[PDB]
Design an enzyme around this catalytic site. Sequence first.
Site, PDB file in Angstrom:
ATOM      1  N   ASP A 180      67.448 -91.168 -41.130  1.00 34.47           N
ATOM      2  CA  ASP A 180      67.587 -90.538 -42.489  1.00 34.47           C
ATOM      3  C   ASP A 180      67.780 -91.591 -43.276  1.00 34.47           C
ATOM      4  OD1 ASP A 180      67.800 -87.926 -41.451  1.00 34.47           O
ATOM      5  OD2 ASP A 180      69.263 -87.280 -42.676  1.00 34.47           O
ATOM      6  N   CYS A 214      54.610 -88.115 -45.282  1.00 31.43           N
ATOM      7  CA  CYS A 214      55.970 -88.092 -45.008  1.00 31.43           C
ATOM      8  C   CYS A 214      56.331 -87.019 -46.180  1.00 31.43           C
ATOM      9  CB  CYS A 214      56.481 -89.654 -45.202  1.00 31.43           C
ATOM     10  SG  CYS A 214      56.056 -90.446 -46.639  1.00 31.43           S
TER      11      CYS A 214
END
Length: 281
Positions: A180, A214
């Site tokens: 993350d 992404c």
Amino acid sequence: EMEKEFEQIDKSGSWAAIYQDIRHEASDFPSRVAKLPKNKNRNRYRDVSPFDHSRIKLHQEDNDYINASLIKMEEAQRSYILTQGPLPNTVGHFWEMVWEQKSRGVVMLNRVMEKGSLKCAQYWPQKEEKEMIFEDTNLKLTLISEDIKSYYTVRQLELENLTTQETREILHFHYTTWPDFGVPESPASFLNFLFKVRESGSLSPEHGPVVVHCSAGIGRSGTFCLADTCLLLMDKRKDPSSVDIKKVLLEMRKFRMGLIQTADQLRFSYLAVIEGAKFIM
């Protein structure tokens, strides 16, 4: 040689500085089509736009716009489509693009949820028996098989053009373990993933360009293309150490803005190419 350049920048802690020189030297081309008011809801981020000159056009007469760029690396003989993670309203456009460009592979470098927010619509089926129909683009998508590994998942998908009843097999390569925050500690699992995509034939000139995304289509997506192109150029050239990562990145930034988002992603890209060069020499 980049290994020595790596130690220099690393020992001197100059990554933020190199990164800023790239930012300042980067191309700036118009993105008029992206900024049209009718396209506002086709963009996930207001500051990430395809350039007009390299943008992918949908073959629908109404609105041809998708947030997607063609990156053509002439010397390496590689193309890539970089795109944002599809939005709820652009999932049908995404698969129309895959169909129209004759792509064999989709490379996904994000999770659907990261940092407690949605980074991408769920644009593929979760079960064999629950196919997805995109009414706006007349496409049906079926999950054929799913192979879940520690660091990535590969899915075989069937895409059917409901207009012509043609069908194609698409491979979905989903890198599931990018953290993350920051970048992976080691590039080993990322290189293994990149070699798996290569082995599939998805990056080969007998197919349309691979689709890479992404969330924005510039950061992780940038790292993927940059590593692949640099390793291919090291195979092709009489002198492998003639390959300058910074120059390759600037050539790629002519086609889509902002590729490689942080100095950490730049450092990671160097490490991936340096490590990948051992498996290629």
